[PDB]
Amino acid sequence: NRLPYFINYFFDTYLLISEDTPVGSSVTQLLARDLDNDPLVFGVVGEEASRFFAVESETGVVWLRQPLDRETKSEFTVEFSVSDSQGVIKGTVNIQVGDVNDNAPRFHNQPYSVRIPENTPVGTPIFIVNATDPDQGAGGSVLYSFQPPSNFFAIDSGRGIVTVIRALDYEVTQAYQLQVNATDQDKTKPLSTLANLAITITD
Numbered sequence: 001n002r003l004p005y006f007i008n009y010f011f012d013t014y015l016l017i018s019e020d021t022p023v024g025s026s027v028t029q030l031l032a033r034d035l036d037n038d039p040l041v042f043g044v045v046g047e048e049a050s051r052f053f054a055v056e057s058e059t060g061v062v063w064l065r066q067p068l069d070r071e072t073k074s075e076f077t078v079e080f081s082v083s084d085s086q087g088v089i090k091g092t093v094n095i096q097v098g099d100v101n102d103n104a105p106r107f108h109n110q111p112y113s114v115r116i117p118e119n120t121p122v123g124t125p126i127f128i129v130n131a132t133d134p135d136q137g138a139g140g141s142v143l144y145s146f147q148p149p150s151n152f153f154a155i156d157s158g159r160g161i162v163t164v165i166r167a168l169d170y171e172v173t174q175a176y177q178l179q180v181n182a183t184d185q186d187k188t189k190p191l192s193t194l195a196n197l198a199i200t201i202t203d
């Protein structure tokens with residue numbers, strides 16, 4: 001009797017599963033050969049592995065049994081079994097959880113309030129806004145803007161630095177209420193968040 005062995009590429013590399021994979025989805029089919037042509041039985045081995053995955057024992061089809069979230073657990077290690085009813089073989093698979101853009105930017109250091117004197121020159125940086133996005137790639141990269149755009153202030157798209165771009169006047173306007181939009185850069189479905197910025201003029 002010779003022991004059966006696993007075929008799939010991912011026993012030697014890794015298996016990618018998207019974090020948006022519906023629970024119940026088949027994520028792969030285990031494949032194995034036996035030089036004796038013995039009928040084969042497949043299994044999943046371990047407590048964490050047996051919560052995440054079920055295996056159809058006669059076909060090797062693997063089902064996801066719990067939702068994934070890359071931002072909570074990005075990778076884990078699982079053991080599958082194959083058996084010819086005389087011996088049992090185990091293979092380890094590294095599971096990588098594939099990222100989707102399922103986070104909108106999150107602001108820190110709120111509320112956002114600044115007092116500036118009315119003599120503040122054009123080009124003066126007055127306040128820094130801060131938003132982060134825990135997604136990977138472009139979906140994790142944030143650009144800042146004013147919604148709607150201001151004639152009196154600008155905000156750096158990259159760094160979130162607010163500047164004065166036209167001279168102020170305490171007489172005309174003693175306060176400004178701005179909306180900072182933070183958008184991620186995903187090509188297909190970008191997500192955005194608005195944050196309040198309060199600017200008070202002194203004299």
Ligand SMILES: [Ca+2]
Pocket residue numbers: 001002003004034035036037038084
């Ligand atoms: Ca065999």
Ligand SMILES: [Ca+2]
Pocket residue numbers: 019070071099100101102103134135136
């Ligand atoms: Ca994500």
Ligand SMILES: [Ca+2]
Pocket residue numbers: 101102103104105133134135139140184191
């Ligand atoms: Ca995002």
Ligand SMILES: [K+]
Pocket residue numbers: 132133134135140141
């Ligand atoms: K990021």
Ligand code: NA
Pocket residue numbers: 019068069070071102103
């Ligand atoms: Na997620």
